[PDB]
Amino acid sequence: TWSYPVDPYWMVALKALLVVVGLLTAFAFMTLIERRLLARFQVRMGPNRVGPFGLLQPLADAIKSIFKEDIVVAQADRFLFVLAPLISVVFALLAFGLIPFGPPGSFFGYQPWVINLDLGILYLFAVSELAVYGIFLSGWASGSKYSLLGSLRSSASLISYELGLGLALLAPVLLVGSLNLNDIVNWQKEHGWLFLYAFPAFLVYLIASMAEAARTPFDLPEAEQELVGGYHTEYSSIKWALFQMAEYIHFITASALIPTLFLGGWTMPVLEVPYLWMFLKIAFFLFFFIWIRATWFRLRYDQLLRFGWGFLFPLALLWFLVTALVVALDLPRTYLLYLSALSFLVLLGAVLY
């Protein structure tokens, strides 16, 4: 935050409360849209009911959510049972204010973002780790080792790919040279759409987000049809609601971060509109991701570990070292564009054998 002002503390609290309730409404209506999009995928049609567009069905769902006998299971830790959903939700909500939805002052006067920390990706990384914390802790506290093992699979996989996220994020820091998102977005304003330079690492970022329960390990697990998952299966009324809420906020957080980091965070070459382009790119990534949700199989967490550990992460660090040589020697900025275009042609031509 070198060139950007600071809103008053009361204004920060106001924006925070607004972002949180907006994330609430957003995840409710995105549950609706995912239901209907999966429906359209499998030629059945969704709930033309309580809406018309269904937009009153989440109200009924929330009305069920409370009054649903929030139960404290025996053989469970009295404190962690209630505490773990709070952890998972608290450390899921935040890390979304940093995402710039417009140039400075475009919040009708004060600030598009909530906080614009000098070290942003590290804050994202830490609060992403604390989600896995909540996951495997709730798994333990449940007092059911069946669900515990699912919590352990979840934690292992999420942790491995969460490690890969660091090497994924290394590459653009060399070019932009700052750990604040606004400098990175402005660099994509000037030179243009960082993924053109770093498409491969972008990939290992994208797939990394698939491992964060988004989909296609899909042996996260959910309690269904496999070794039951952790962090649920013992919570009934509101805590289960908090688990699902935090998981979906994490999904949408990745769907929002992917364009912010590599592609064009709003900052368009054309029409330069603050919010609409970012929300539309969120919509694009969300639709492609639901396409993945519907259209692809599971991974069984063994091949998932193999693919993440042996393939994604060495590739990400190789690209990081390449970019580091190029940046420290600063020879062109063109070389990275050429190399990423060539690498994409490579990883593309090998498909249609």
Place this chain on the structure above:
Amino acid sequence: TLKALAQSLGITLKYLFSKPVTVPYPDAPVALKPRFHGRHVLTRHPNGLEKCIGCSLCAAACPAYAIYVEPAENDPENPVSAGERYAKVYEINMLRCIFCGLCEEACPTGAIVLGYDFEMADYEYSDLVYGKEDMLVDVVGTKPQRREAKRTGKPVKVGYVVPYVRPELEGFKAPTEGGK
């Protein structure tokens, strides 16, 4: 075969943009075939005489023995059947009934014939024993349907349409293919 992931996505997309195939029950009437196995009906001759001579053959052909047929003796002045016998008490336990069609097959007077109504979900066991005056062709609807039409004031809307009624269902009034 990395191409197969993209092919799978492509086919899910083609089918995404193809909207139609589904039927929105109860807003759209389900198309039922004429030979469908539904709620029993008792048919009457054109004279108006009942066809059931209370011969308890429909109950024997029941693999659950779910049909109770108490017979009785016709009154010549104002008869109910064509012969000398009728069905004083004719009950079917819908919770015992398995909907074969063997009772329609064994009826020699064509009295018992399966219909088309399937909307007979109700709340109480003792309310799922359908009676004679709950199955006569002259009746319009199922038990909860008629009860809701009375406690509601709105006539019964059946959740089905058929291309026609079979000849075996002479008298049974039903929505026919769009003639109405």
Place this chain on the structure above:
Amino acid sequence: MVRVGMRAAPRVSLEALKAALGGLKLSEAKVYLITDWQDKRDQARYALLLHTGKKDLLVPDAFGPAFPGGEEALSELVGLLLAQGARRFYEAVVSPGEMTALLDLPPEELLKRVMAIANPTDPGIYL
């Protein structure tokens, strides 16, 4: 197999069963509350056949709300059986005529038939 209690005297049947049950632990016992007409419990009558595996106990048709003081007696009875540690409760639906003669069949046939026809039941319907 012993027979205690008397027909259509709920309190007599219940007090006699109180006396005869004693300190018998029912952890592995089988409780058979025999009745007719599955649905209508407001007028129901009940016999009882308790099969410990080592010896059996028979109570004739004196329980259920069908008799004055019968509903509270069946509630007390099922509560007692649950207190003594029973988990397996059963209900057999017999024809009215079967209820009478089945207590007069030899013990082997009565017990075999009841065990073969019994349905698992939730004591909550009798409490």
Place this chain on the structure above:
Amino acid sequence: MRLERVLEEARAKGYPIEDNGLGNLWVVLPRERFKEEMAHYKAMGFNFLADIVGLDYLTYPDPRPERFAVVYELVSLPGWKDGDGSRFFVRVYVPEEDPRLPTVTDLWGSANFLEREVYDLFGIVFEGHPDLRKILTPEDLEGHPLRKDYPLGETPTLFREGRYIIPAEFRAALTGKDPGLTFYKGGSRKGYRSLW
């Protein structure tokens, strides 16, 4: 081809050979010779053991040697190494008071479950089995359901006002020993078969 050799091997030792004109064959081995003979039967090339079907003949109209009778079904798959396709049954009578019979688990693993089932449904214990554990009936169920001395245990069907049905006294069907509602049964209702 091997079935003809089975018949020729059995007939020499005095084994009855049962045949209906429908294409089904029985070779009844005594219990002594049962185990070794059927071991040889596997050795004769019987890959596949189809069934273990136990039968309780308590209410059968005609008398039989023993109450229980267990029938094994031996086959040789035509599509395997050298497949003939010869399939036939072996019946072995088991007394009411001697529900013993050696297992063919060691011979075929197929009888692992199958034999267990007959111990559940009949009182027949198969000696030498890895685990003879009740398969189908509940652990607390007392007796063996498919033997004729075990009730079917029906419940009355329910109606409006005291009208009830006890199906056993409602059946117009007859059994083999059931005399019927007239003084006698002859003709078609003593057994009926059309002459193609």
Place this chain on the structure above:
Amino acid sequence: REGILFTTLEKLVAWGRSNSLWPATFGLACCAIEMMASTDARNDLARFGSEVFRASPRQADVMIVAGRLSKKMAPVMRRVWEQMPDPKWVISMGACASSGGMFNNYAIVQNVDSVVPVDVYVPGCPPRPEALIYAVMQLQKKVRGQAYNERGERLPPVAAWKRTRG
């Protein structure tokens, strides 16, 4: 607080619970296939609020007994009912479950209402998918306080609310 104690709030939450019916199938027999068919692209119980399908019982309010209930399963299914959150409903699907059906024998429970409190009965064999929808709409209006029997009585919103579990 049980969805009660205010004239507006109880109608509101009845609305919510009715359109928020979360069916938890306990697939037993050929009834269960006709329930799974009530999810395909001709007739989906995926509109009224029944899209999501949580296999866990800690998470669903409607329990649909779809099939014959054999005695060896009677306690297990039973415990799933005891291990459910309290605002829960139970539907008995089909003939074998509702009554003893044609299998009037030693093996099958002759009414599943023995082990679990049944809300609605739905005859048929199998009950047509549209009939199962009819029963879930029946249960919808039942939890709204909109359901009456043949004898004139109004049926309480939740069965399994009136029983001394033990």
Place this chain on the structure above:
Amino acid sequence: MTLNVGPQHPSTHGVLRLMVTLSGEEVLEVVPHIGYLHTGFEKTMEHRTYLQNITYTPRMDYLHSFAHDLAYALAVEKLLGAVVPPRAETIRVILNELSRLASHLVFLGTGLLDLGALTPFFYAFRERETILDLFEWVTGQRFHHNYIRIGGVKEDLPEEFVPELKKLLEVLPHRIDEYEALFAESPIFYERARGVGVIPPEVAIDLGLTGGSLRASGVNYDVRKAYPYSGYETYTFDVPLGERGDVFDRMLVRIREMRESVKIIKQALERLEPGPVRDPNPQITPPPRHLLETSMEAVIYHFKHYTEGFHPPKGEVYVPTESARGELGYYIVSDGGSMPYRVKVRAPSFVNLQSLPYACKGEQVPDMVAIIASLDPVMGDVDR
């Protein structure tokens, strides 16, 4: 970890309990525990008329029922010598292959959904809906259809049945080819199923694994070919096979089986000529409904046939057929009475299940669900 995979959970279709002896991520051994669906067809059939039992026969295997219908009908026919019209046999093979298509659709749908993607369940099942409507035309029922009879089929086909069949027969080849294009060129499914589910034919035979997963192990044994019963001898037939028994070869063999069933349906439809519908033997057929008001013997025979039934001779019989889960047959012991003395069922799903601890031996823990869905069990057949 002696892990208790309970019944129905986690989402183990076909209510069944599993004791997975398990250390780590492998599978030491799965001990199956069944019986939660024991209803007693073999016992209840001893107290029901021969005609009444045709209402009990489809309910065991509720997915492929017409094979049970055929097996029971053929066994009783052979037992009392009925004469099947040719059109009855043609229609019987039509309905048999059609219900086989519907059974296979459900098997592959449940398998893909159980582990993998949820989408491909609907499309296949959608086609199943179409098929179901056909039965409603002729039987008035979705399944559990009572259409077969001792002589043949109950009554003749409506005019509107065949054109709908032709509609479905023309849309189906592209559809099955689409499922096969999605699956056979397995992008991720290959690294999931090609290795798993070992089926060495020696032990598969030692345990009696007959149900179509034996030919996935390279054993060419089909009851329709080895023991022609209902005129399958009169059809051009290709028998799919697998190289090494795994889940991939199993699923692909069953898809090719669906195409082979569609081809058999076309072949039978072409050779269809009008005629009678069942064996008129008055001891086996009730008199036609029109002369119930003209002839005394008709009234007596209609009454008697539908109350008492007929009494087949004293004897035992058995007939083999090939259902979607293997060799199927009824060992019927008749005592000369209206109701069979005993009906024993060779449940192909019963002997098919002895090979699970072997199949899922050493495999992964998540794959234990796929290896079970891939075995195609119908627990209505096992518990029985």
